[PDB]
């Protein structure tokens, strides 16, 4: 019995999300995760969706100036909650997401949550600050007929469940 069991039974089971993880608000790094897939399938790699140790990317600005940036993925989650913007976007598992929206103290059936949403090609993610100094990360994949709104409700339901514990 672990966080995996809990994430799987309470959230992955909804079929509304392609993956879900929990990160500490201390560093924004995912410490537990689950993903849709046929474990095992020798070859599913849930962690590649949720984690990548620091890496440099090359960036070119509109002046054609090329620089190199070190991405710390955890910091890109924290910056959105801490500052209300993402200077470099939100990066998770080596994938860049566009920061689309944040709501603070969004009310969901008697419980209030800070919720951020980010988008990528045919999918996206939600970040929800949840009890016990944690951040929930939920992924959705529009190729799977999951959607932005339904995945958010799934995440919110799970968060409420946590709050209720």
């Amino acid at each position: 019995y672990s966080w995996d069991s809990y994430l799987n039974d309470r959230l992955l089971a909804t079929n509304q999300v392609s993956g879900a993880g929990l990160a500490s608000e201390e560093d924004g790094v995912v410490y537990a995760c689950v993903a849709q897939g046929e474990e095992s399938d020798p070859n599913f790699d849930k962690w590649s969706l949720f984690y990548k140790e620091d890496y440099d990317i090359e960036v070119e600005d509109e002046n054609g100036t090329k620089t190199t940036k070190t991405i710390n993925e955890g910091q890109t989650i924290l910056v959105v909650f801490n500052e209300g913007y993402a200077p470099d976007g939100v990066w998770l598992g080596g994938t860049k997401y566009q920061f689309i929206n944040i709501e603070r103290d969004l009310e969901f059936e008697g419980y209030n949550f800070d919720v951020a949403t980010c988008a990528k090609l045919k999918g996206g993610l939600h970040l929800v600050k949840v009890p016990g100094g944690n951040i929930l990360v939920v992924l959705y994949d529009e190729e799977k007929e999951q959607d932005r709104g339904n995945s958010k409700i799934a995440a919110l339901t799970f968060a409420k469940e946590l709050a209720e514990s």
Binding site: S2, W3, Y6, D9, L22, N134, L162
Partner: peptide
Amino acid sequence: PPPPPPPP
């Protein structure tokens, strides 16, 4: 250290 999962 991660927290313990909630009871089922």
